[PDB]
mmCIF file of C-alpha atoms and ligand atoms in Angstrom:
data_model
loop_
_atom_site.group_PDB
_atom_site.id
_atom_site.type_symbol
_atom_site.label_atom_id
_atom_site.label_comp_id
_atom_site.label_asym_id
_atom_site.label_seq_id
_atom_site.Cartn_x
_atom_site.Cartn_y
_atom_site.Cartn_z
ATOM 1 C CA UNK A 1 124.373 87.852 102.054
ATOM 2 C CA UNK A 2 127.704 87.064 103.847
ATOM 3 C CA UNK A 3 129.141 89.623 106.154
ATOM 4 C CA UNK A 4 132.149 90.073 108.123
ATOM 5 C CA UNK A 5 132.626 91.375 111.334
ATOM 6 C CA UNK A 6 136.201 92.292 113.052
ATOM 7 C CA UNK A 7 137.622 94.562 115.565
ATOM 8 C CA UNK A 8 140.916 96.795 114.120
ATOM 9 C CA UNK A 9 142.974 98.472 116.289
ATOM 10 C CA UNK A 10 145.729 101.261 114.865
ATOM 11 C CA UNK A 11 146.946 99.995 111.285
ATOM 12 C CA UNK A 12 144.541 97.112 110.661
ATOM 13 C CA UNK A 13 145.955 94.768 113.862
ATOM 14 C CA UNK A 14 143.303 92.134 114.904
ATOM 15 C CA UNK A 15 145.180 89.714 116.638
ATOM 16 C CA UNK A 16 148.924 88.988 118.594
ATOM 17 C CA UNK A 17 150.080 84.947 119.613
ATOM 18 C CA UNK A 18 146.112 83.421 119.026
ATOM 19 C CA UNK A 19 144.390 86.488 121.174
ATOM 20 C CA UNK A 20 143.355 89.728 120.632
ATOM 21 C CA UNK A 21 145.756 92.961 122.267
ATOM 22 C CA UNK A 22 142.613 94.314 124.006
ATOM 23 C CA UNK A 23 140.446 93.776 126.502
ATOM 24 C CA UNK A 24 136.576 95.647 125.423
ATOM 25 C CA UNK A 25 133.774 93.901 126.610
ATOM 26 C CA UNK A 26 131.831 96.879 124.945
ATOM 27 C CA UNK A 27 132.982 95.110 121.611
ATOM 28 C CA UNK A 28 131.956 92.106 122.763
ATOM 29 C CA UNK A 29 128.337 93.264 123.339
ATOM 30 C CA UNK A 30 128.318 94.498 120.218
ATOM 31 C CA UNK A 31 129.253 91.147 118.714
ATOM 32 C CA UNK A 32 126.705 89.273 120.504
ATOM 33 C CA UNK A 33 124.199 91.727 119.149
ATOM 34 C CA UNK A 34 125.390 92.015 115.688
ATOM 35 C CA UNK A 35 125.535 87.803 115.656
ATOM 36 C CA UNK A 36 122.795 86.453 117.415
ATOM 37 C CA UNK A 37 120.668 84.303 115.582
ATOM 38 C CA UNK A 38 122.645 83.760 112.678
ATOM 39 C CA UNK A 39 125.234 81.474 111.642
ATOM 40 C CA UNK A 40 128.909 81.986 112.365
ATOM 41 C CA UNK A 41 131.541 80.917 110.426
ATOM 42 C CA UNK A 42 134.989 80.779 112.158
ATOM 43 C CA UNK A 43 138.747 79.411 111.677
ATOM 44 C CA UNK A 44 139.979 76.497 114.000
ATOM 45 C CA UNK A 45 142.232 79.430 115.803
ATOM 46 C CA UNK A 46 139.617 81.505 116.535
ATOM 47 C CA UNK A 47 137.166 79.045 117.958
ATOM 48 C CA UNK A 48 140.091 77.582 119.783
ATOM 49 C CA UNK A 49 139.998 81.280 121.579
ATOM 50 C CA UNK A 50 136.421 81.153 122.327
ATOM 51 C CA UNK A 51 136.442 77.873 124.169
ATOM 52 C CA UNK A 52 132.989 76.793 123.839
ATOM 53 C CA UNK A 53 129.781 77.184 121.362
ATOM 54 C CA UNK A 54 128.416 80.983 120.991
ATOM 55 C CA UNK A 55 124.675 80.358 122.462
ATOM 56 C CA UNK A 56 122.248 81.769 120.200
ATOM 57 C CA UNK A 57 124.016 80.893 116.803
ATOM 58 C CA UNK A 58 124.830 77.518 114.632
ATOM 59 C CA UNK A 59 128.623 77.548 115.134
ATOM 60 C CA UNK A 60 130.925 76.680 112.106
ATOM 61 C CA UNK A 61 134.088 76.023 112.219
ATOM 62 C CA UNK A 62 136.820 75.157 109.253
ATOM 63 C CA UNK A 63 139.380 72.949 109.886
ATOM 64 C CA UNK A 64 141.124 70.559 107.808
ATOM 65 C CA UNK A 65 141.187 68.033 110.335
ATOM 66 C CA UNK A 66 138.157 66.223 112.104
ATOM 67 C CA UNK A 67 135.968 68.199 114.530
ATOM 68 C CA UNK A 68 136.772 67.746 117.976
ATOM 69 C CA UNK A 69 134.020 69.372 119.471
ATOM 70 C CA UNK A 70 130.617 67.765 118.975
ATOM 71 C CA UNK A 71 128.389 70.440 119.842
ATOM 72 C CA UNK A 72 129.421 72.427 116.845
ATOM 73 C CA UNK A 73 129.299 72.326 112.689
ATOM 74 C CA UNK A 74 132.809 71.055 111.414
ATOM 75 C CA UNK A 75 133.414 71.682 107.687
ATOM 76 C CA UNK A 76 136.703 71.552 105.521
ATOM 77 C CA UNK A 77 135.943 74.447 102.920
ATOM 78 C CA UNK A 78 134.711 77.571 102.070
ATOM 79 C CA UNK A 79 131.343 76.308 100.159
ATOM 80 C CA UNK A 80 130.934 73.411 102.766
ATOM 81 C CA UNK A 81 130.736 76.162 105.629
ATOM 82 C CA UNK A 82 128.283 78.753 103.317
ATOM 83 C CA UNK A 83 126.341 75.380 102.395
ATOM 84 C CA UNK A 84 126.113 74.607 106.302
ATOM 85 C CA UNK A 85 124.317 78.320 106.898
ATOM 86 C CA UNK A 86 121.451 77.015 104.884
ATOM 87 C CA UNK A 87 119.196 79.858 103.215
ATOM 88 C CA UNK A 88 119.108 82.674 106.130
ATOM 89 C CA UNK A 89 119.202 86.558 105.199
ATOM 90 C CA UNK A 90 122.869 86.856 106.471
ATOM 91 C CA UNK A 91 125.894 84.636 106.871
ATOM 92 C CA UNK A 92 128.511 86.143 109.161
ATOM 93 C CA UNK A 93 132.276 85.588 109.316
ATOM 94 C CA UNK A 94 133.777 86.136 112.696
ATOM 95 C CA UNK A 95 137.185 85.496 111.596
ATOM 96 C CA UNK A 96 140.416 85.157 111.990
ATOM 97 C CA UNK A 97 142.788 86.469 109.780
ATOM 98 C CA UNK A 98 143.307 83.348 107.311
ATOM 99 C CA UNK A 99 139.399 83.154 106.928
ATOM 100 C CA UNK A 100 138.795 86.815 106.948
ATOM 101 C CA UNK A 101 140.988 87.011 103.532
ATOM 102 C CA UNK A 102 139.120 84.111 102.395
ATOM 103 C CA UNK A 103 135.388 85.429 102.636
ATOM 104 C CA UNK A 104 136.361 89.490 102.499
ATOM 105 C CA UNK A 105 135.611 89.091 97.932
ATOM 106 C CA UNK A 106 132.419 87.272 98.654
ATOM 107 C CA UNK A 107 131.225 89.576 101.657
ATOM 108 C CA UNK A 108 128.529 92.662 101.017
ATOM 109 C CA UNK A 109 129.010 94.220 104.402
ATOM 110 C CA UNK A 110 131.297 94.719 106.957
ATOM 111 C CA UNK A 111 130.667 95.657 110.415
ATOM 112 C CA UNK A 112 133.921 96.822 112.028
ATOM 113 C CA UNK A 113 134.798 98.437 115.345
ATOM 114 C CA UNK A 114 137.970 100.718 115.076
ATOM 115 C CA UNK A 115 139.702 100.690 117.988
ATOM 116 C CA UNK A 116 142.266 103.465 119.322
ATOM 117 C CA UNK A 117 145.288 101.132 119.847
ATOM 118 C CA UNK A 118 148.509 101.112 119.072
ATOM 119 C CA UNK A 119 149.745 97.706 119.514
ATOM 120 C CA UNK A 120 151.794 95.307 117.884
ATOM 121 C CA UNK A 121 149.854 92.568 116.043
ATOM 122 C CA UNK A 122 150.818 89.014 114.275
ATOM 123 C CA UNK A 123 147.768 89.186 112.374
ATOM 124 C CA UNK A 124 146.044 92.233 110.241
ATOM 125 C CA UNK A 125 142.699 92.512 108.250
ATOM 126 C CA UNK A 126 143.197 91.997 104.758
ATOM 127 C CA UNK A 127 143.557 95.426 102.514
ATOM 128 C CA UNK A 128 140.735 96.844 100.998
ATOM 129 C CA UNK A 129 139.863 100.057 98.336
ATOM 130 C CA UNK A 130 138.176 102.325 100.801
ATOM 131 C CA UNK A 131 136.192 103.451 97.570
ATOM 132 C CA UNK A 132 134.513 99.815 96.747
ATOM 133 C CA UNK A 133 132.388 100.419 100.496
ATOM 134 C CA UNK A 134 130.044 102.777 101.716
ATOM 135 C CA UNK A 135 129.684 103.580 105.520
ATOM 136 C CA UNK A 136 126.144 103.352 106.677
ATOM 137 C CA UNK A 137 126.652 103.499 110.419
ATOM 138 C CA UNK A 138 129.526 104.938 113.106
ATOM 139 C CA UNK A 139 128.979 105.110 116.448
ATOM 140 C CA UNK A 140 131.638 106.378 118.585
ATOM 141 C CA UNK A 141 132.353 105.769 122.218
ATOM 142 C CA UNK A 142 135.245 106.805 124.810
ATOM 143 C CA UNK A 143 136.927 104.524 127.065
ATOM 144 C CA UNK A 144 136.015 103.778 130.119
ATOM 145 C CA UNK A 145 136.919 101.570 133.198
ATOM 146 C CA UNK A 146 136.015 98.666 131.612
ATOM 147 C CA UNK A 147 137.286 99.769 127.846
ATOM 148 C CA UNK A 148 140.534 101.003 128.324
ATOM 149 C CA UNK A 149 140.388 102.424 124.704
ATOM 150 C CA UNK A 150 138.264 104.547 122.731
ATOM 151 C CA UNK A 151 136.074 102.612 120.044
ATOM 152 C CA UNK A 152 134.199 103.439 117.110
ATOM 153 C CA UNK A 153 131.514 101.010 115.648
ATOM 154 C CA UNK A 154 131.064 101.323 111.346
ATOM 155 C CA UNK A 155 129.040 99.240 109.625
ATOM 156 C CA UNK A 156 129.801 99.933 105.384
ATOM 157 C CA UNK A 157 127.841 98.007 103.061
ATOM 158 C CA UNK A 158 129.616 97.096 99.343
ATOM 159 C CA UNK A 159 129.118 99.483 96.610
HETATM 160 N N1 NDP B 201 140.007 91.239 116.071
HETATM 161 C C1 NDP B 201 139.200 90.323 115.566
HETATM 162 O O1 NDP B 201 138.037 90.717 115.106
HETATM 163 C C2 NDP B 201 139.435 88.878 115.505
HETATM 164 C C3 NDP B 201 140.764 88.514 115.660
HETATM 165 N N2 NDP B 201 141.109 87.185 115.632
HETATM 166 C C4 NDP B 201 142.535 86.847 115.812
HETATM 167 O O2 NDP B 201 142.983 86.242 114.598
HETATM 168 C C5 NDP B 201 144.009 85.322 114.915
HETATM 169 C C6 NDP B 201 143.677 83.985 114.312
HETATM 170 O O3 NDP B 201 143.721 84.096 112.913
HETATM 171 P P1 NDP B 201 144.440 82.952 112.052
HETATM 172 O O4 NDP B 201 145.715 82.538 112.726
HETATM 173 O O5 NDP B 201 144.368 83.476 110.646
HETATM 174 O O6 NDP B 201 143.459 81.696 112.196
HETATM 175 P P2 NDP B 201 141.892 81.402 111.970
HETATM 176 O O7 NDP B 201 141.100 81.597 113.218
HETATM 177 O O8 NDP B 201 141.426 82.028 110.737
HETATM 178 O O9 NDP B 201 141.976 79.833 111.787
HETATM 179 C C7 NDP B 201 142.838 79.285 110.767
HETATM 180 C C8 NDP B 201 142.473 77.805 110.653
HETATM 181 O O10 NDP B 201 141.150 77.610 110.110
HETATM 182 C C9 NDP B 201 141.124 76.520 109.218
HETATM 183 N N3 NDP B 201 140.773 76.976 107.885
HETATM 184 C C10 NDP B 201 140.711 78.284 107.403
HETATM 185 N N4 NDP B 201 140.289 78.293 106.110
HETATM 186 C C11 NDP B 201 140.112 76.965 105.771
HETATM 187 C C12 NDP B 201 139.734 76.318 104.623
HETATM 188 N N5 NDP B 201 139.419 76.974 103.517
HETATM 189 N N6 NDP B 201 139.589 74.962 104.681
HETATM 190 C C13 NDP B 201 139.921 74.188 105.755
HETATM 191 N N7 NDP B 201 140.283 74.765 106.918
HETATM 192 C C14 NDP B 201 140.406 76.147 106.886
HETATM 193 C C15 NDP B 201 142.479 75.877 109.303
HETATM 194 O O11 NDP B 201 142.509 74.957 110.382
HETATM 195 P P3 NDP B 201 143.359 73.573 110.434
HETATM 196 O O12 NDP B 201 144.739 74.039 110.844
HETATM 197 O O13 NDP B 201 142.746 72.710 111.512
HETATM 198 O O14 NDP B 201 143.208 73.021 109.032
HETATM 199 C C16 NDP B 201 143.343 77.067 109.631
HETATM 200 O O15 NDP B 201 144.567 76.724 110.278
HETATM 201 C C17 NDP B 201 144.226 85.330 116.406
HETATM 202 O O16 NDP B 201 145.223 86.294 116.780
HETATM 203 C C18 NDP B 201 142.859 85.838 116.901
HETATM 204 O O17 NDP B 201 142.926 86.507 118.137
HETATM 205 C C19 NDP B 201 140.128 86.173 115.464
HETATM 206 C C20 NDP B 201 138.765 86.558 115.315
HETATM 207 C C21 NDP B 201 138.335 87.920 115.316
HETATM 208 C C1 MTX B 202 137.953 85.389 120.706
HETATM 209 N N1 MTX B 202 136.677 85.792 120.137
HETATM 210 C C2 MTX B 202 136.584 86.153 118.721
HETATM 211 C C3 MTX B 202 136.131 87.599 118.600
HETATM 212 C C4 MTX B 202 136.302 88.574 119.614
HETATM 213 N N2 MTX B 202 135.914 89.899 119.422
HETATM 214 C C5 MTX B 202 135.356 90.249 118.227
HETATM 215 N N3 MTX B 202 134.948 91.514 118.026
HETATM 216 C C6 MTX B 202 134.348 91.866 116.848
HETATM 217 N N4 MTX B 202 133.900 93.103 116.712
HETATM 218 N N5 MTX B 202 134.293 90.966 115.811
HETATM 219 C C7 MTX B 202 134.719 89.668 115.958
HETATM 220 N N6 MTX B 202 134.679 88.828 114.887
HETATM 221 C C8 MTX B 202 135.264 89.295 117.195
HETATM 222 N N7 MTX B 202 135.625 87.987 117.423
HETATM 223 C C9 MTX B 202 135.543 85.841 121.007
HETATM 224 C C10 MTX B 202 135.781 85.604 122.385
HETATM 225 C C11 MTX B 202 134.679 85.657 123.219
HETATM 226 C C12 MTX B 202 133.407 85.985 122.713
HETATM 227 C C13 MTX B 202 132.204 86.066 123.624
HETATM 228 O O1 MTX B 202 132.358 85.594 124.864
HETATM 229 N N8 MTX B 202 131.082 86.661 123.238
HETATM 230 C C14 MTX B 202 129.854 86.680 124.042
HETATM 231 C C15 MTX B 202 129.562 88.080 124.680
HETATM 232 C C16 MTX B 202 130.223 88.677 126.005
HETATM 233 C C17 MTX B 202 129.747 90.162 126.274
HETATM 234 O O2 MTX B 202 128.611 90.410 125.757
HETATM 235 O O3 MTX B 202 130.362 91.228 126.909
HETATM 236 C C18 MTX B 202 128.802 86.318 123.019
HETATM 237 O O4 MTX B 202 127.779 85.636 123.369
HETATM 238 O O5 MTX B 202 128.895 86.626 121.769
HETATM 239 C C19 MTX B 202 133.170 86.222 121.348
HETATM 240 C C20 MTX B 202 134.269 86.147 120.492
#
């Protein structure tokens, strides 16, 4: 199954000038736990912002261009990165926007944190019908002094 997993603040904003407009090492954690030990598949932006491999996961990144980066999986598609998962249970797409809109029709589940910010982004999850998804999980948390927003964790599973 191929899942997606983003964090939106106020009206679907996931991203401002190749970073993110919050600072939530509570998401982060939840990343890390929602990822480990499965394959990620991520756009030549986003791994740009992470900086080095995710430990714990085989690390795919698109790009059209050679890999420059030898401790990760380079691929130049769509079916070359779902090929390079291999057969696991669950594929997940870390982003960023570009590949989000690309892998959003093939995903089953999305696990999303909702964060209470209202702040100007370059990039924005791609639309969705509400109706096509079911939410399984939400888990709500306040800010605190190191969150400066209040969160909300959903995981919603395709109908
Ligand atoms: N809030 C969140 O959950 C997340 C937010 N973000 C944010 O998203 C933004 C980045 O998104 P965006 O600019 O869309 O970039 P992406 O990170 O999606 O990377 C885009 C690049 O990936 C490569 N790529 C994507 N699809 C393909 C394909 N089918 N075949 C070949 N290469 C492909 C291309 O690289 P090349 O140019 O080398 O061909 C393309 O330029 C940043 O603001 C970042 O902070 C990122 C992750 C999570
Ligand atoms: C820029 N970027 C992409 C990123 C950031 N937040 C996200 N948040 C969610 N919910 N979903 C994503 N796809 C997502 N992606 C990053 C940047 C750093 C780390 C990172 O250092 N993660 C550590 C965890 C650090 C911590 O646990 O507090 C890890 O091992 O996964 C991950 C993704």
């Amino acid at each position: 199954m191929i899942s997606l997993i983003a964090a939106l603040a106020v009206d679907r904003v996931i991203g401002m000038e190749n970073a993110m407009p919050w600072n939530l090492p509570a998401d982060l954690a939840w990343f890390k736990r929602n990822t480990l030990n499965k394959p990620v598949i991520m756009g030549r932006h986003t791994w740009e912002s992470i900086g080095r491999p995710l430990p714990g996961r085989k690390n795919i990144i698109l790009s059209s261009q050679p890999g420059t980066d030898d401790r990760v999986t380079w691929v130049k598609s769509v079916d070359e990165a779902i090929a390079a998962c291999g057969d696991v249970p669950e594929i997940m797409v870390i982003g960023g926007g570009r590949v989000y809109e690309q892998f959003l029709p093939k995903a089953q589940k999305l696990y999303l944190t909702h964060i209470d910010a209202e702040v100007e982004g370059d990039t924005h999850f791609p639309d969705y019908e509400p109706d096509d998804w079911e939410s399984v999980f939400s888990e709500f948390h306040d800010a605190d002094a190191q969150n400066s927003h209040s969160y909300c964790f959903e995981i919603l599973e395709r109908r």
